[PDB]
C-alpha cells in the first residue's frame, strides 16, 4: 500500500514511534519517505544479497529471514513478507529494535543521508495530529 504523508504520520503515531528513543515523529516519515517513497512494498536487493524491505527498507541480513540471506539473524523474528504488509506493526515493531540498537537513526542511511540535521518537523505539518 502506498501511504500519504499525514495518514502515515498518524499511523506511526499511533504505533508508538514519536519521539520513540528521542526521535520525534518527523524523523520517521522522513526515513519513510526516502527509504521507500510511502510504498510498504518496497523492496531493493543489496549487493552482498540480502535484501531491505517495507517502508523503512529493513535489511535481511541482520534482521527479518527471506530464506535467501545465507547467516542472516533474523533479530526481529519475522519473515521479511511480514515488512510489506498494509498494516505497519510489523515494521514498526522491528524499527524500534533496530534503533534500539546502538547508533539510533543512523542505522538508516536516507535518514543519515537526508533526514538528519533537517528541518524534519516539516514532515508532520498540516496533519491533524
Request: hydrophobic share 35%; aromatic share 10%.
Amino acid at each position: 500500500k502506498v501511504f500519504g504523508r499525514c495518514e502515515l504520520a498518524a499511523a506511526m503515531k499511533r504505533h508508538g514511534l514519536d519521539n520513540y528513543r528521542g526521535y520525534s515523529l518527523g524523523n520517521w516519515v522522513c526515513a519513510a519517505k526516502f527509504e521507500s517513497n510511502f510504498n510498504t512494498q518496497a523492496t531493493n536487493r543489496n549487493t552482498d544479497g540480502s535484501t531491505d524491505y517495507g517502508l523503512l527498507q529493513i535489511n535481511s541480513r541482520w534482521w527479518c529471514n527471506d530464506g535467501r540471506t545465507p547467516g542472516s539473524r533474523n533479530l526481529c523474528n519475522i519473515p521479511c513478507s511480514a515488512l510489506l504488509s498494509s498494516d505497519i506493526t510489523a515494521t514498526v515493531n522491528c524499527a524500534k529494535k533496530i534503533v534500539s540498537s546502538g547508533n539510533g537513526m543512523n542505522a538508516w542511511v536516507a535518514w543519515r543521508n537526508r533526514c538528519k540535521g533537517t528541518d524534519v518537523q516539516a514532515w508532520i505539518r498540516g496533519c491533524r495530529l
